[PDB]
Amino acid sequence: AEAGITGTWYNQLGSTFIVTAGADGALTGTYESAVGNAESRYVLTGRYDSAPATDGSGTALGWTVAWKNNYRNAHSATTWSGQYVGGAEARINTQWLLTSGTTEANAWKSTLVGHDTFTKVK
Amino acid sequence: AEAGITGTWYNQLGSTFIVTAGADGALTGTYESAVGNAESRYVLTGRYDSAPATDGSGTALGWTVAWKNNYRNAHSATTWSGQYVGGAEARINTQWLLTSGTTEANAWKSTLVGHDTFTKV
């Protein structure tokens, strides 16, 4: 539901996610991280299922943030993959991959994996 | 480095990725998978580092595809995270996460993980 996803959300680390869900399945917005080599807001883009199943199944979605803005550049990018569950306590449960640019010899250790849960603010 | 990402890429499964990289960090294009509950092309959007390091490091990037188009709807989405390495034989090395919409009872088995390598051949 675009109106379900659209809004301001926060995760367990204190980071902010502001997103707008479009009728064509597009997601656009900004992300502010509470941790890492990051400062201020960064641009995010993604996609979601705009015609989900009418049962109690979640809405699949995903988005990306490249950690470069006009103030800092960490030479890394993160992608979040998960689903939106709406209702009184709507949540977006995700798993993420954070890849840093490295030399070919240090590539084996270029990707971190984790999970974040977002709660929507009214 | 830079521009080199724009083009048509293919992975080991035979899927096709057509992308345009914008000067300020955006990635836009279409994806066609050779496997799965998919048929024809789907829209993709992502981001990449438009000012990478000057030592011999790769260019970090990522993108997403929601598997719904005029033909089918698989009620799932995949995100690829990796880095671009240019040179005589450029490649994009990635790891991906594919999440399907499920009921809460099946949420523990909603996400698949894999890796894909793309080249221009």
Next chain:
Amino acid sequence: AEAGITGTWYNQLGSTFIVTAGADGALTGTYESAVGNAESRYVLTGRYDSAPATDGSGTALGWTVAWKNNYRNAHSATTWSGQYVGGAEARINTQWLLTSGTTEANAWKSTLVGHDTFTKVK
């Protein structure tokens, strides 16, 4: 601390983990899952850091379960990777990979990824 890890633990899905930590860094025990194509107990084996850092860092560890016992065989195996944090509320936080045996053509979809948090029972 072998005495810290050794014990009975439960995760958020209602599954049971019984383990013994050895002086040489070995982990042995049984696992009972609340979900999936599984029934009864399964054998588990793993390793942990038996000489961790003396600061507030966790103790790294990991273990594996192949889902075959004398009653059922699901032709799959799971590995849990994480760390032990002790104190009053001791927890083992993990991320896991579940791989199923498949034909080469369906290999791209052979592995699931998730996370489990275990609480120790007294």
Next chain:
Amino acid sequence: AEAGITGTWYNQLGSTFIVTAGADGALTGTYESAVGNAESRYVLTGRYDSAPATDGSGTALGWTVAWKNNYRNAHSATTWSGQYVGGAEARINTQWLLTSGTTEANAWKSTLVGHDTFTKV
């Protein structure tokens, strides 16, 4: 199928894996990594499906290495999960998770993920 797992295997990085597969599902041996905060050999233990399916499916397995031995202690552990495929050129295809001990404040960046392919060459 079966016995074929016992032996010496090498991955793309040049690391060496020496394992013994027991009739009832156990895996035991040593590992030597070519990269990282490691030197010499380390002990490994795991499990595999000792009765796989009869169609053309692979054999599921997994194993763990805590990176402490008489020489160094990196305060980390890695687990590999994958499947064994036998034939003229057998391989073990895996995805791994490497967790380092951290303070709670750094727990968000404690785990690395990757993939390794092992062959007997």
